[PDB]
């Protein structure tokens, strides 16, 4: 099963100029917890932005070009990246926009963080059919001294 995980602000903005504007620690903790010990798939721009491999997970990078770093697994196709994960129970796709659009149709679960913030970005999460997904879990949180905005964690599963 494939899952997608993303943090979205107002207007489904996921990012601006390859960066996440906000500071949400609670959000980092949710991501880590949901991805630990699972393979993660990401697009080359995302990888660039991360700089080093996420520890405790198999890092698969999608790019059309040959890889340039032996610490991660390079693949050139969606199907290739899925095969590189082997027989694990859940594959986590981590962005960016172009990757999420591609994996959406195959995904069975979406882990989303809706952040109450207004930012301008150049990329948006794919517009998905809400009728096709069931909201199985949802927990809202008010801003606090560590978290500057309110946010809500949500998990959806494809009907
Ligand atoms: N808010 C969040 O949760 C979240 C999560 C992830 C990312 N983001 C954000 O999103 C931005 C990035 O999105 P973008 O789009 O970049 P991306 O998605 O990270 O990367 C796309 C690159 O991946 C490679 N690729 C994609 N599909 C491919 C395929 N089928 N075959 C081969 N290579 C493929 C291509 O690289 P080549 O050019 O090498 O072919 C493509 O240019 C930033 O602003 C960032 O902060 C946010
Ligand atoms: Ca069902």
Curated annotation (Swiss-Prot):
Record carries keyword Oxidoreductase: yes
- Residues recorded as binding NADP(+), renumbered to this chain, are 7, 13-19, 45-46, 63-64, 76, 95-102
Outcome of mutating residue 20 to L: Increases catalytic rate 2.5-fold. Increases catalytic rate about 7-fold
Question: What's the gene?
Answer: folA
Q: What is this protein called?
A: Dihydrofolate reductase
Signal peptide segment: none
Q: Which organism is it from?
A: Escherichia coli (strain K12)
Q: Does the keyword NADP apply?
A: yes
Name any GO cellular component annotation.
Answer: cytosol
Known outcome of mutating residue 92 to F: No effect. Increases catalytic rate about 7-fold
- Which UniProt keywords are present, listed alphabetically? Antibiotic resistance, Methotrexate resistance, NADP, One-carbon metabolism, Oxidoreductase, Trimethoprim resistance
